[PDB]
Short mmCIF file of all heavy atoms in Angstrom, two decimals:
data_model
loop_
_atom_site.label_atom_id
_atom_site.label_comp_id
_atom_site.label_asym_id
_atom_site.label_seq_id
_atom_site.Cartn_x
_atom_site.Cartn_y
_atom_site.Cartn_z
N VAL E 31 0.99 -10.45 34.38
CA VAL E 31 0.72 -11.58 33.49
C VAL E 31 0.11 -11.10 32.18
O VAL E 31 0.38 -11.64 31.11
CB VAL E 31 -0.16 -12.64 34.17
CG1 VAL E 31 -0.23 -13.86 33.28
CG2 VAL E 31 0.38 -13.02 35.53
N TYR E 32 -0.75 -10.07 32.25
CA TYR E 32 -1.30 -9.51 31.02
C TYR E 32 -0.19 -8.96 30.14
O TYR E 32 -0.19 -9.18 28.92
CB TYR E 32 -2.33 -8.42 31.32
CG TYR E 32 -2.70 -7.62 30.08
CD1 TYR E 32 -3.58 -8.13 29.14
CD2 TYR E 32 -2.16 -6.37 29.85
CE1 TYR E 32 -3.92 -7.42 28.01
CE2 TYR E 32 -2.48 -5.64 28.72
CZ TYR E 32 -3.36 -6.18 27.80
OH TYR E 32 -3.69 -5.46 26.67
N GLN E 34 2.98 -9.91 30.07
CA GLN E 34 3.87 -10.95 29.57
C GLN E 34 3.17 -11.86 28.56
O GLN E 34 3.74 -12.17 27.51
CB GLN E 34 4.42 -11.79 30.74
CG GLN E 34 4.99 -10.99 31.90
CD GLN E 34 6.33 -10.36 31.59
OE1 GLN E 34 6.41 -9.30 30.97
NE2 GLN E 34 7.40 -11.02 32.03
N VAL E 35 1.96 -12.31 28.88
CA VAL E 35 1.34 -13.40 28.14
C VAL E 35 0.15 -12.92 27.31
O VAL E 35 0.08 -13.17 26.10
CB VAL E 35 0.92 -14.53 29.09
CG1 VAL E 35 0.98 -15.87 28.39
CG2 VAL E 35 1.81 -14.54 30.32
N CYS E 36 -0.81 -12.24 27.95
CA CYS E 36 -2.02 -11.85 27.24
C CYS E 36 -1.73 -10.79 26.18
O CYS E 36 -2.35 -10.81 25.11
CB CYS E 36 -3.08 -11.32 28.20
SG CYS E 36 -3.23 -12.11 29.82
N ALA E 37 -0.80 -9.88 26.45
CA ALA E 37 -0.60 -8.72 25.59
C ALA E 37 -0.10 -9.09 24.21
O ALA E 37 -0.16 -8.25 23.30
CB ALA E 37 0.38 -7.73 26.24
N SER E 38 0.41 -10.31 24.02
CA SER E 38 0.91 -10.69 22.71
C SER E 38 -0.20 -10.73 21.68
O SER E 38 0.04 -10.45 20.50
CB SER E 38 1.60 -12.05 22.80
OG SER E 38 2.71 -11.99 23.67
N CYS E 39 -1.42 -11.07 22.09
CA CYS E 39 -2.51 -11.24 21.14
C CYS E 39 -3.83 -10.61 21.57
O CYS E 39 -4.65 -10.31 20.69
CB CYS E 39 -2.74 -12.73 20.87
SG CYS E 39 -1.22 -13.57 20.35
N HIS E 40 -4.06 -10.38 22.86
CA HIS E 40 -5.29 -9.76 23.34
C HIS E 40 -5.06 -8.29 23.64
O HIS E 40 -4.02 -7.91 24.20
CB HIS E 40 -5.81 -10.47 24.59
CG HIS E 40 -6.42 -11.81 24.31
ND1 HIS E 40 -7.74 -11.96 23.95
CD2 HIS E 40 -5.89 -13.05 24.34
CE1 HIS E 40 -8.00 -13.24 23.77
NE2 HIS E 40 -6.89 -13.92 23.99
N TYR E 94 -2.48 -6.22 17.20
CA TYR E 94 -2.66 -6.28 15.77
C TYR E 94 -3.27 -4.99 15.24
O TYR E 94 -4.13 -4.40 15.90
CB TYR E 94 -3.55 -7.47 15.38
CG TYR E 94 -3.03 -8.79 15.90
CD1 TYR E 94 -3.61 -9.40 17.00
CD2 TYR E 94 -1.95 -9.41 15.30
CE1 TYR E 94 -3.14 -10.60 17.48
CE2 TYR E 94 -1.47 -10.61 15.77
CZ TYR E 94 -2.07 -11.21 16.86
OH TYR E 94 -1.59 -12.41 17.33
N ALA E 100 -5.38 -9.90 13.11
CA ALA E 100 -5.56 -10.81 14.24
C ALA E 100 -6.07 -12.17 13.78
O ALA E 100 -5.57 -13.21 14.22
CB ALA E 100 -6.51 -10.19 15.27
N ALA E 103 -3.29 -14.05 12.02
CA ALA E 103 -2.25 -14.54 12.92
C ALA E 103 -2.76 -15.57 13.92
O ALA E 103 -1.94 -16.23 14.57
CB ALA E 103 -1.61 -13.37 13.67
N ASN E 104 -4.08 -15.72 14.07
CA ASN E 104 -4.64 -16.67 15.03
C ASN E 104 -5.59 -17.65 14.35
O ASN E 104 -6.67 -17.95 14.86
CB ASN E 104 -5.34 -15.93 16.17
CG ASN E 104 -4.40 -15.03 16.93
OD1 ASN E 104 -3.21 -15.30 17.04
ND2 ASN E 104 -4.93 -13.93 17.46
N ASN E 105 -5.18 -18.16 13.19
CA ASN E 105 -5.89 -19.25 12.50
C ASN E 105 -7.35 -18.90 12.24
O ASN E 105 -8.25 -19.73 12.38
CB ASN E 105 -5.79 -20.55 13.30
CG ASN E 105 -4.35 -20.97 13.55
OD1 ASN E 105 -3.93 -21.14 14.69
ND2 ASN E 105 -3.59 -21.13 12.47
N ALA E 107 -9.30 -16.90 13.90
CA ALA E 107 -10.06 -16.54 15.09
C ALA E 107 -9.64 -15.17 15.60
O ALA E 107 -8.46 -14.82 15.56
CB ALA E 107 -9.88 -17.58 16.19
N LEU E 108 -10.61 -14.40 16.07
CA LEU E 108 -10.35 -13.07 16.60
C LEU E 108 -10.25 -13.13 18.11
O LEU E 108 -11.25 -13.46 18.77
CB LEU E 108 -11.44 -12.09 16.17
CG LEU E 108 -11.33 -10.68 16.73
CD1 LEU E 108 -10.05 -10.01 16.26
CD2 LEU E 108 -12.54 -9.85 16.34
N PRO E 109 -9.10 -12.83 18.70
CA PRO E 109 -9.01 -12.78 20.17
C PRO E 109 -9.75 -11.57 20.71
O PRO E 109 -9.39 -10.42 20.40
CB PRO E 109 -7.50 -12.67 20.42
CG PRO E 109 -6.96 -12.06 19.18
CD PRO E 109 -7.81 -12.56 18.05
N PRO E 110 -10.78 -11.79 21.52
CA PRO E 110 -11.62 -10.67 21.96
C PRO E 110 -10.86 -9.68 22.83
O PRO E 110 -9.89 -10.03 23.50
CB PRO E 110 -12.74 -11.36 22.76
CG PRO E 110 -12.70 -12.79 22.32
CD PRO E 110 -11.27 -13.08 22.02
N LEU E 112 -10.03 -7.77 25.98
CA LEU E 112 -10.11 -8.23 27.37
C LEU E 112 -10.49 -7.12 28.34
O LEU E 112 -10.54 -7.36 29.55
CB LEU E 112 -8.78 -8.85 27.79
CG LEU E 112 -8.76 -10.37 27.89
CD1 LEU E 112 -9.45 -10.99 26.69
CD2 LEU E 112 -7.34 -10.88 28.01
N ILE E 115 -13.98 -8.41 29.20
CA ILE E 115 -14.21 -9.84 28.97
C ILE E 115 -14.90 -10.48 30.17
O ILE E 115 -15.71 -11.40 30.02
CB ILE E 115 -12.89 -10.54 28.61
CG1 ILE E 115 -13.16 -12.00 28.23
CG2 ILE E 115 -11.89 -10.44 29.75
CD1 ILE E 115 -14.05 -12.16 27.02
N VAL E 116 -14.57 -10.02 31.38
CA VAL E 116 -15.22 -10.56 32.57
C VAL E 116 -16.70 -10.21 32.58
O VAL E 116 -17.56 -11.08 32.79
CB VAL E 116 -14.51 -10.06 33.84
CG1 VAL E 116 -15.39 -10.24 35.04
CG2 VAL E 116 -13.21 -10.80 34.03
N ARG E 119 -18.98 -12.07 29.64
CA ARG E 119 -19.25 -13.50 29.64
C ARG E 119 -20.12 -13.87 30.84
O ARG E 119 -19.93 -13.34 31.94
CB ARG E 119 -17.95 -14.30 29.67
CG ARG E 119 -17.12 -14.16 28.41
CD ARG E 119 -17.92 -14.56 27.18
NE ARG E 119 -17.12 -14.49 25.96
CZ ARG E 119 -16.99 -13.40 25.21
NH1 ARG E 119 -17.59 -12.26 25.54
NH2 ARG E 119 -16.25 -13.45 24.12
N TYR E 125 -16.05 -17.70 35.15
CA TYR E 125 -15.93 -18.41 33.89
C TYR E 125 -14.50 -18.35 33.36
O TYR E 125 -13.91 -19.39 33.03
CB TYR E 125 -16.90 -17.83 32.87
CG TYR E 125 -16.55 -18.12 31.43
CD1 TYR E 125 -16.77 -19.37 30.87
CD2 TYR E 125 -16.00 -17.13 30.62
CE1 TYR E 125 -16.45 -19.63 29.56
CE2 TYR E 125 -15.68 -17.39 29.30
CZ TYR E 125 -15.91 -18.64 28.77
OH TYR E 125 -15.59 -18.89 27.46
N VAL E 126 -13.91 -17.15 33.33
CA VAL E 126 -12.60 -16.97 32.70
C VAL E 126 -11.57 -17.88 33.35
O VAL E 126 -10.84 -18.61 32.67
CB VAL E 126 -12.17 -15.50 32.76
CG1 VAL E 126 -10.80 -15.32 32.16
CG2 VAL E 126 -13.19 -14.62 32.05
N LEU E 129 -12.03 -21.26 32.21
CA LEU E 129 -11.54 -21.37 30.84
C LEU E 129 -10.03 -21.53 30.81
O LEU E 129 -9.49 -22.32 30.04
CB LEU E 129 -11.97 -20.15 30.03
CG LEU E 129 -11.39 -20.08 28.62
CD1 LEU E 129 -11.98 -21.16 27.74
CD2 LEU E 129 -11.63 -18.72 28.04
N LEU E 130 -9.32 -20.78 31.66
CA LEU E 130 -7.87 -20.92 31.71
C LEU E 130 -7.44 -22.17 32.47
O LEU E 130 -6.30 -22.60 32.32
CB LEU E 130 -7.24 -19.70 32.37
CG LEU E 130 -7.46 -18.32 31.75
CD1 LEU E 130 -6.69 -17.30 32.56
CD2 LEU E 130 -7.04 -18.30 30.29
N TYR E 133 -8.40 -27.53 30.49
CA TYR E 133 -7.98 -27.78 29.11
C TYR E 133 -7.79 -29.28 28.90
O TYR E 133 -6.77 -29.74 28.39
CB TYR E 133 -6.70 -27.01 28.77
CG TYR E 133 -6.95 -25.74 27.99
CD1 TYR E 133 -6.84 -24.50 28.59
CD2 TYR E 133 -7.29 -25.79 26.64
CE1 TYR E 133 -7.06 -23.34 27.88
CE2 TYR E 133 -7.52 -24.63 25.92
CZ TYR E 133 -7.40 -23.41 26.54
OH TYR E 133 -7.62 -22.26 25.83
N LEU E 146 -7.71 -25.85 16.51
CA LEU E 146 -8.58 -25.76 17.67
C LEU E 146 -8.11 -26.70 18.76
O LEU E 146 -7.53 -27.76 18.50
CB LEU E 146 -10.03 -26.09 17.30
CG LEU E 146 -10.68 -25.21 16.23
CD1 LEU E 146 -12.14 -25.56 16.10
CD2 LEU E 146 -10.51 -23.75 16.55
N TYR E 151 -15.10 -25.71 29.11
CA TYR E 151 -15.85 -24.52 29.51
C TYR E 151 -16.13 -23.58 28.35
O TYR E 151 -16.97 -22.69 28.49
CB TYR E 151 -15.10 -23.79 30.62
CG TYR E 151 -15.19 -24.49 31.96
CD1 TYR E 151 -14.15 -25.28 32.42
CD2 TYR E 151 -16.32 -24.37 32.75
CE1 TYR E 151 -14.23 -25.93 33.63
CE2 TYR E 151 -16.41 -25.01 33.97
CZ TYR E 151 -15.36 -25.79 34.40
OH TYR E 151 -15.45 -26.43 35.61
N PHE E 152 -15.45 -23.74 27.22
CA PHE E 152 -15.79 -22.96 26.04
C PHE E 152 -17.12 -23.47 25.47
O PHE E 152 -17.35 -24.68 25.44
CB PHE E 152 -14.69 -23.06 25.00
CG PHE E 152 -14.82 -22.07 23.88
CD1 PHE E 152 -14.48 -20.75 24.06
CD2 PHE E 152 -15.29 -22.47 22.64
CE1 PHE E 152 -14.60 -19.83 23.04
CE2 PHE E 152 -15.41 -21.56 21.60
CZ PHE E 152 -15.06 -20.24 21.80
N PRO E 153 -18.01 -22.57 25.04
CA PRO E 153 -19.33 -23.02 24.58
C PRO E 153 -19.30 -24.06 23.47
O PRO E 153 -20.10 -25.01 23.50
CB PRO E 153 -20.00 -21.72 24.13
CG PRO E 153 -18.89 -20.73 23.96
CD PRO E 153 -17.87 -21.11 24.98
N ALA E 156 -14.51 -26.26 21.48
CA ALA E 156 -13.41 -26.21 20.52
C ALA E 156 -12.96 -24.75 20.43
O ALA E 156 -13.49 -23.97 19.64
CB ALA E 156 -13.83 -26.75 19.16
N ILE E 157 -11.98 -24.39 21.25
CA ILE E 157 -11.47 -23.03 21.28
C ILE E 157 -10.20 -22.96 20.45
O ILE E 157 -9.44 -23.93 20.34
CB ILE E 157 -11.22 -22.56 22.74
CG1 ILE E 157 -11.00 -21.05 22.78
CG2 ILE E 157 -10.05 -23.30 23.35
CD1 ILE E 157 -10.97 -20.48 24.18
N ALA E 158 -9.96 -21.80 19.85
CA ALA E 158 -8.80 -21.58 19.00
C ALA E 158 -7.60 -21.05 19.77
O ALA E 158 -6.57 -20.76 19.16
CB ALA E 158 -9.14 -20.63 17.86
N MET E 159 -7.71 -20.91 21.09
CA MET E 159 -6.61 -20.44 21.93
C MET E 159 -5.89 -21.65 22.50
O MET E 159 -6.49 -22.47 23.20
CB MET E 159 -7.12 -19.55 23.06
CG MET E 159 -6.08 -19.32 24.15
SD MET E 159 -6.63 -18.36 25.57
CE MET E 159 -8.20 -19.13 25.95
N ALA E 160 -4.60 -21.77 22.19
CA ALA E 160 -3.77 -22.76 22.85
C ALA E 160 -3.65 -22.40 24.33
O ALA E 160 -3.73 -21.23 24.70
CB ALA E 160 -2.39 -22.81 22.22
N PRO E 161 -3.47 -23.40 25.20
CA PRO E 161 -3.36 -23.12 26.64
C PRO E 161 -2.33 -22.04 26.91
O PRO E 161 -1.13 -22.25 26.73
CB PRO E 161 -2.93 -24.47 27.23
CG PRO E 161 -3.51 -25.46 26.29
CD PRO E 161 -3.44 -24.84 24.92
N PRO E 162 -2.78 -20.85 27.34
CA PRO E 162 -1.88 -19.70 27.35
C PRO E 162 -0.96 -19.64 28.55
O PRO E 162 0.10 -19.01 28.46
CB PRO E 162 -2.85 -18.51 27.35
CG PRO E 162 -4.03 -19.03 28.10
CD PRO E 162 -4.14 -20.50 27.78
N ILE E 163 -1.33 -20.26 29.66
CA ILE E 163 -0.56 -20.17 30.89
C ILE E 163 -0.21 -21.57 31.37
O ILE E 163 -0.95 -22.53 31.13
CB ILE E 163 -1.32 -19.40 31.99
CG1 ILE E 163 -2.65 -20.08 32.30
CG2 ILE E 163 -1.55 -17.95 31.57
CD1 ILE E 163 -3.47 -19.36 33.33
N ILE E 181 -1.43 -18.01 38.65
CA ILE E 181 -1.39 -17.11 37.50
C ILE E 181 -2.79 -16.82 37.00
O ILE E 181 -3.15 -15.66 36.75
CB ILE E 181 -0.50 -17.71 36.40
CG1 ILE E 181 0.96 -17.79 36.86
CG2 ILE E 181 -0.63 -16.91 35.12
CD1 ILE E 181 1.83 -18.71 36.02
N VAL E 185 -4.72 -13.23 36.93
CA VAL E 185 -5.22 -12.67 35.68
C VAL E 185 -6.69 -12.33 35.81
O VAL E 185 -7.15 -11.28 35.34
CB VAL E 185 -4.98 -13.64 34.51
CG1 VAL E 185 -5.62 -13.10 33.25
CG2 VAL E 185 -3.52 -13.81 34.29
N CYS E 186 -7.47 -13.22 36.42
CA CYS E 186 -8.89 -12.96 36.56
C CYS E 186 -9.15 -11.78 37.48
O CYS E 186 -10.07 -10.99 37.24
CB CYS E 186 -9.60 -14.22 37.06
SG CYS E 186 -9.59 -15.53 35.84
N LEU E 189 -8.45 -8.74 35.35
CA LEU E 189 -9.52 -8.54 34.38
C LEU E 189 -10.78 -8.00 35.05
O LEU E 189 -11.49 -7.17 34.48
CB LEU E 189 -9.81 -9.84 33.63
CG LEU E 189 -8.70 -10.44 32.78
CD1 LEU E 189 -9.17 -11.72 32.10
CD2 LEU E 189 -8.19 -9.45 31.75
C1 HEC K 401 -3.09 -16.31 20.13
C2 HEC K 401 -2.65 -16.87 21.50
C3 HEC K 401 -3.56 -16.48 22.70
C4 HEC K 401 -3.07 -16.10 23.88
C5 HEC K 401 -1.65 -16.41 24.38
C6 HEC K 401 -4.20 -15.97 24.77
N1 HEC K 401 -5.36 -15.95 24.02
FE1 HEC K 401 -7.24 -15.58 24.70
N2 HEC K 401 -8.03 -16.20 22.92
C7 HEC K 401 -7.27 -16.40 21.78
C8 HEC K 401 -8.16 -16.68 20.67
C9 HEC K 401 -7.75 -16.96 19.21
C10 HEC K 401 -9.57 -16.63 21.26
C11 HEC K 401 -10.91 -16.86 20.54
C12 HEC K 401 -11.00 -18.31 20.08
C13 HEC K 401 -12.34 -18.55 19.44
O1 HEC K 401 -13.22 -17.66 19.54
O2 HEC K 401 -12.53 -19.63 18.83
C14 HEC K 401 -9.39 -16.33 22.66
C15 HEC K 401 -10.41 -16.19 23.57
C16 HEC K 401 -10.28 -15.72 24.86
C17 HEC K 401 -11.28 -15.75 25.90
C18 HEC K 401 -12.72 -16.31 25.79
C19 HEC K 401 -13.53 -15.56 24.73
C20 HEC K 401 -14.83 -16.28 24.50
O3 HEC K 401 -15.52 -15.95 23.51
O4 HEC K 401 -15.17 -17.17 25.31
C21 HEC K 401 -10.75 -15.20 26.99
C22 HEC K 401 -11.45 -15.02 28.35
C23 HEC K 401 -9.39 -14.80 26.68
N3 HEC K 401 -9.14 -15.14 25.37
C24 HEC K 401 -8.48 -14.21 27.52
C25 HEC K 401 -7.17 -14.63 27.57
C26 HEC K 401 -6.38 -14.85 28.75
C27 HEC K 401 -6.87 -14.65 30.19
C28 HEC K 401 -5.18 -15.28 28.38
C29 HEC K 401 -4.04 -15.65 29.37
C30 HEC K 401 -2.63 -15.22 28.93
C31 HEC K 401 -5.17 -15.34 26.92
N4 HEC K 401 -6.40 -14.93 26.47
C32 HEC K 401 -4.13 -15.71 26.11
C33 HEC K 401 -5.90 -16.35 21.68
C34 HEC K 401 -5.00 -16.27 22.72
#
Side-chain angles (χ1 to χ4, degrees):
Chain E
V31 188
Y32 168 78
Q34 311 286 82
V35 210
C36 323
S38 298
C39 306
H40 286 274
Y94 304 104
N104 300 330
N105 303 123
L108 176 62
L112 255 45
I115 185 62
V116 163
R119 294 303 182 272
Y125 159 76
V126 178
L129 174 69
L130 301 182
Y133 260 106
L146 301 187
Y151 286 100
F152 192 77
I157 193 171
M159 166 184 47
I163 59 182
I181 294 164
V185 175
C186 292
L189 297 181

